[PDB]
């Protein structure tokens, strides 16, 4: 389709400016982070998650904010 | 303006014990009602209607770069000089073209430029608002009495039969009476100030169409946009680009349409026509049908005296009964239509109900047609038409026994509970205690939780569910089914409610 | 926000000829929601076509609007001397609402030269202190004339006045009125006064004086 | 039989304030916009706004925006373009226009022309215009009617009480310092005139002024 | 953008045929299957740290497939 | 009725995202390099040295 | 040099000619003449008959739904021939020089 | 972007007379960095002032600069006769470098009208088919002055061509041409040309003319 799976990233020699670059690195992070945004009702919600469980302290957190980024868009 | 054929046609149980009703209703749903003394009766909304529509705001999705002005100063003079940021229709970027001795500049490898090209949108597209007090409701009602297949299908007949009706409620006016004529009149009670939230979106037009898109939402949309009426845009410069500086030159580049993207960016979106209006199709509307002049002609008429006929041949509905229409020969018209449900021909005893009520000949002309329906039992049945052999019957199946049926009933439940929210609780209509309650119950539960996490789509919540799932089977006792509670249901059933 | 222009801006036509009165969206795609209106001078303007694809009640199929989002067209493959009117199309995509510059329906004819008559000012107006040349130029067709006022040989622009009839509407000329009005001292201190008219008709200025001096 | 009748065309003067009715009629009033149209008096269709008619919240066009009231009365129909401190701009054929919205304005006011300036009521200055030895064309001697200096319009100017329409060109009232001038030119045979009588007959009701002012030969 | 970030979903009202219908309920799995798809050598590295960390069995599981979500929309 | 969507022309922009801007009008000019030649100074002199 | 193009895209087609071609419950798929010509392209479908509507059963239907395709506006690629490649160098020695 | 204005245009003046010159700084606060530039015609300029506040070393203490950065004045307490010239003011706080619209120093004297004198084209001119009316108004104070060309009545602005002297250098008044150039033709086919000059010392136009008619 033309909404994703773009060319990006060629990355065969091609050393010079793409033709999108800086919209890409915003890609992830935001939207994921608008719709999180959007549903701070969800991040209430969403990193209660991994502390619940296994008792392993750094790593309980390894579930939730990660999980966090899962959500939007799936 | 009938349930006649229609896809989602659901009778309605009369309980009796009041002539009025609250009732919840939809555009494409006709609502079929029955009780006692009450006639079978069609009610279904038209469409909704919003006459009078005005533009929240509009938006650029396709532009074109021009006027390309890049002004190049020399290394070290700083920040570059187009006077186009004097001009909104220009769109100016600083910047700087690397230097040799050789182009334009006595220095190496930095520079300055101011770049300018004019702005122009090649295409743009529009939100809309809706006023409620500019929404409509247009619910046809009708009422099943001496029918045929044209009349029954056709309004301006039954305008005239008086068994039809068509109206607008608005919060202004929220309730409307009518008579039925010779049934008598009925009233509908409705709150089109609850009905939809008209404020809940907008009416974004995206080509010649126009859709529903959440107000937040709407604006969340990226793209260059502009005042409702004119002219002065937000980040036009998002359809256009840039390019190196080789000496001077460098070319602002507007992307191309991005329609296609905006179809994209609707998927939750609806369908809605402008005409001198946006009329709606999906409805929701809280109405109070009162039947308290809602009567019954034809009790003294006699059971008709004559062979009768199939105008058309037994068939059901779909929606669980059988619909046939009687020509009848006899000219002892206006008479009683004697027809029964029975289960064996051996035996007399009416099983199954009449949908439509107190089946009538109108008149006396002889073969008037009349479009008449009852309901079957499940199992084999006899549609039965007549006294003695001048009687005819008909054979009927209906396998949909009861446990089955029950879960069309149960089941259909909560998926008339989910996803319509806490008005699912007007199915519970004549309510209180528990009905009254259980809106309670999801009343305010509702309005948070799965809100809460609501605006994920299909399996995303679904997934959090099936994420949510061994945190039944790994926890303590008496604590296993509290944050088991929210996994299945109201969440995997709006899930698994689209499976697909 | 959003622009039109609507050409011709007018057209001398047979009646029953087919002309196609374009029209087109300067912003965005108008898609749908452009209507054609006609205008009989006078009258509030008569909607013609909606979406501009698709005829009114009222309206009859002869007129045929099409084009599409940048471009429309109000075709009337049968004008007529009914269909005579000033013709509108209107982006309603986006308030705000606008019109393009319109279009006349002028039924064709044959090119007639104004018969122009040019008065001195009477009796009632040389006793008044005032005086206009007054000079009626009559039943030209085209409407596309020329006027000028030449006094002593030198020509004068000043106290000039024009009045003309639209397409005449038995014989669909023109007529016009040009009047030089004066004041009765620099009417008499100068003598010749001409009304010249250069009409399509003609390839000279058609000329018609008097000399104050002269009867 | 959807109508929108406006108030009726009426004169005014700079500084004042004029607020046009437009009833609506044949539908439903609230389920539909209400749209203003300005006609000025020699240029198109120039959009004023709308109004809500459900809500009675009015939008105008930038140009439109603060000198004009959209407002309407629910029960009887009746939108109203209402302009504050009038302005000879202010004069033109004014429209409300029923929305069908996107799909444009259906029906139209029958349409109010504002005349907004300051003179006074003037009777015309009617000359009968005789033709000179130029103005002889063929049979026909082009004959004429000078009115000069009225207001307001109109005048109204036949030819022996109308009997001669036929070689009559009555040209269009144009102003002169706010009053008016139309030039009438009959084109009679010189056979008759001046041998029968040939009089332009200017009826100026506004000022109450019928003007019978015949043709003889200078 | 264009993409990404649709109305979808209304969920208001509408028993009813939405505009874009069918996309919405495929987006997710595909295009995060076709890109993982596209690329096999990512997928099998997600399953490693599942096991390598938490060490409780059932929840180990929740790693992987988890992630190999998060690198479709990162 | 059918219905077709929108020009996806910008959303093949937007398919673009590391694209190479390329000129093909009989023939493609393509930018970024990449060859490996082997100079030879044989034949190369220095001019001046007297 | 001369670059081959392996095929063509449409990016904007039309919806053109909408056919659609009906028939009763249970009488089954509709056909069309339009799926003869792959210019047209068909959907079946249904769409419930009471008997309002045309047909003796209740709550089925048949239609063949069809356009015409047409490609309005459509994109393309192009294979570059590997012996078309060219590299155009411009190579330089430093002698006396100027600016210009 | 920074705008000067200095005024006056021009002053007429006793020499030793104080006349100030104004000047004020649009934008900012120019602070110091402003000037004064004597350019007398066709020289190039010459600094008088510096920093507003400050004489160059050649321009004498006559000239002083004053006024602190929205505005300022160019003073000579004794203005002379060798101070009979163009002066400009310059903000030079920023670039760009801008000029004010200069004062020019005029001497004073007393008002002196114009000696006008209307020649026909020579009959070396006419010879040509080309005809140039002349009319030379001359040593006029000050140079406040207009010319009308009046033809058989009818002034006519056309083929009008004015040349003037500047300040006189003995008088100090002005003296002017007025050229009405015409085609022989319409030169032949009117009569009276008629150059009339309104001048300040003159409450009317002086009027000189020739009929060709007359010799």
């Known amino acids: 389709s033309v909404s994703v799976q773009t060319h990006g990233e060629s990355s065969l020699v091609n050393k010079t400016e793409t033709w999108l670059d800086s919209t890409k690195a915003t890609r992830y992070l935001m939207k994921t982070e608008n719709w999180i945004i959007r549903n701070p009702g969800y991040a209430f919600l969403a990193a209660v998650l991994g502390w619940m469980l296994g008792s392993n302290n750094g790593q309980r957190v390894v579930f939730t904010i990660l999980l966090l980024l899962v959500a939007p868009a799936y | 303006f009938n349930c006649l054929g229609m896809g989602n046609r659901d009778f309605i149980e009369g309980a009796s014990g009041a002539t009025w009703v609250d009732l919840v209703l939809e555009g494409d749903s006709c609502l079929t009602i029955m009780a006692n003394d009450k006639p079978t009766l069609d009610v279904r909304m038209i469409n909704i209607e919003a006459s009078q529509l005005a533009e929240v705001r509009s938006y650029c999705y396709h532009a074109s770069v021009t006027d390309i002005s890049t002004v190049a100063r020399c290394p070290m003079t700083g920040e570059a000089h187009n006077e186009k940021r004097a001009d909104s229709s220009y769109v100016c970027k600083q910047g700087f073209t690397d230097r040799g001795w050789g182009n334009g500049c006595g220095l190496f490898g930095k520079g300055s430029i101011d770049t300018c090209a004019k702005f122009s949108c090649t295409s743009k597209a529009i939100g809309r608002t809706i006023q409620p007090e500019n929404i409509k409701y247009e619910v046809g009602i009708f009422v099943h009495g001496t029918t045929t297949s044209e009349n029954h299908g056709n309004y301006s007949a039954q305008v005239g039969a008086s068994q039809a009706a068509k109206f607008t409620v608005t919060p202004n006016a929220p309730s409307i009476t009518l008579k039925l004529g010779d049934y008598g009149e009925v009233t509908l009670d409705c709150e089109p100030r609850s009905g939809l939230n008209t404020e809940a979106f907008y009416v974004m037009t995206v080509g010649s169409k126009s859709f529903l898109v959440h107000r937040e939402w709407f604006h969340d949309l990226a793209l260059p946009w502009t005042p409702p009426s004119s002219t002065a845009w937000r980040n036009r410069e998002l359809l256009m680009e840039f390019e190196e500086a080789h000496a001077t030159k460098q070319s602002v580049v507007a992307l191309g349409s991005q329609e296609g993207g905006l179809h994209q960016a609707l998927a939750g979106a609806i369908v809605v026509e402008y005409s001198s209006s946006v009329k709606l199709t999906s409805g929701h509307l809280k109405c109070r049908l009162k039947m308290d002049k809602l009567a019954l002609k034809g009790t003294t008429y006699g059971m008709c005296t004559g062979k009768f006929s199939f105008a058309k041949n037994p068939a059901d509905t779909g929606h669980g009964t059988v619909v046939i229409e009687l020509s009848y020969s006899g000219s002892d018209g206006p008479c009683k239509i004697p027809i029964v449900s029975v289960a064996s021909l051996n035996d007399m005893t009416p099983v199954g109900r009449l949908v439509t009520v107190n089946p009538f000949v109108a008149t006396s002309s002889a073969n008037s047609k009349v479009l008449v329906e009852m309901e079957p039992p499940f199992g084999d049945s006899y549609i039965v038409v007549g006294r003695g052999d001048k009687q005819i019957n008909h054979h009927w199946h209906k396998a949909g026994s009861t446990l089955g049926k029950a879960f069309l009933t149960t089941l259909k439940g909560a998926q008339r509970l989910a996803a319509l929210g806490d008005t699912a609780w007007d199915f519970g209509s004549i309510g209180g205690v528990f009905n009254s309650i259980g809106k309670a119950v999801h009343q305010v539960f509702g309005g948070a939780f799965r809100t809460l996490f609501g605006g994920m789509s299909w399996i995303t919540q679904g997934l959090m569910g099936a994420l949510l799932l061994w945190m039944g089977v790994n926890a303590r006792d008496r604590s296993i089914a509290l944050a088991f509670l929210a996994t299945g249901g109201v969440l995997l059933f709006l899930a698994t409610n689209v499976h697909a | ?215 | 039989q959807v109508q929108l009748m406006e108030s009726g065309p009426e004169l005014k003067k700079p500084g004042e304030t004029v607020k046009i009715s437009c009833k609506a009629s044949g539908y439903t009033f609230t389920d539909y916009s209400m749209h203003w149209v300005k006609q000025a008096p020699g240029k198109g269709l120039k959009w004023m706004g709308w109004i809500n008619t459900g809500t009675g919240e009015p939008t105008f066009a930038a140009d439109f925006k603060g000198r004009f009231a959209f407002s309407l009365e629910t029960s009887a129909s009746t939108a109203y373009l209402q302009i504050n401190n009038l302005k000879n701009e202010d004069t033109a054929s004014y429209f409300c226009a029923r929305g069908v919205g996107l799909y444009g304005v259906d029906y139209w006011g029958q349409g109010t022309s504002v005349t907004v300036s300051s003179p006074k009521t003037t009777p015309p200055s009617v000359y009968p215009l005789a033709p000179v030895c130029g103005d002889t064309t063929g049979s026909m001697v082009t004959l004429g009617c000078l009115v000069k200096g009225y207001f307001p319009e109109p005048v109204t100017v036949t030819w022996n009480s109308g009997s001669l329409s036929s070689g009559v060109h009555t040209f269009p009232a144009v102003l002169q310092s706010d009053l008016y001038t139309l030039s009438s030119s009959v084109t009679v045979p010189s056979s008759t005139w001046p041998s029968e009588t040939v009089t332009c007959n200017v009826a100026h009701p506004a000022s109450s002024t019928k003007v019978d002012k015949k043709i003889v030969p200078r």
């Open chain 3, 1 to 215: 926000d959003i622009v039109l222009t609507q050409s011709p801006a007018s057209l001398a036509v047979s009646l029953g000829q087919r002309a196609t009165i374009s029209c087109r969206a300067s912003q965005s795609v108008s898609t749908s929601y452009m209507h054609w209106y006609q205008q009989k001078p006078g009258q509030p303007p008569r909607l013609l076509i909606y979406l501009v694809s698709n005829l009114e009640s009222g309206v009859p199929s002869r007129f045929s609007g099409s084009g599409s989002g940048t471009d429309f067209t109000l075709n009337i493959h049968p004008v007529e001397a009914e269909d005579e009117a000033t013709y509108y199309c209107q982006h309603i995509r986006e308030l705000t609402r606008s019109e393009a510059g319109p279009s006349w329906l002028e039924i064709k004819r044959a090119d007639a030269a104004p018969t122009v008559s040019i008065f001195p000012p009477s009796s009632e107006q040389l006793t008044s202190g005032g005086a206009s040349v007054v000079c009626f130029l009559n039943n030209f067709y085209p409407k596309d004339i020329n006027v000028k006022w030449k006094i002593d040989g030198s020509e004068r622009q000043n106290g000039v006045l024009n009045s003309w009839t639209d397409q005449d509407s038995k014989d669909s000329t023109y007529s016009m009125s040009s009047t030089l009005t004066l004041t009765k001292d620099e009417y008499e201190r100068h003598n010749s006064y001409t009304c010249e008219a250069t009409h399509k008709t003609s390839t000279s200025p058609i000329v018609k004086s008097f000399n104050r001096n002269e009867c």
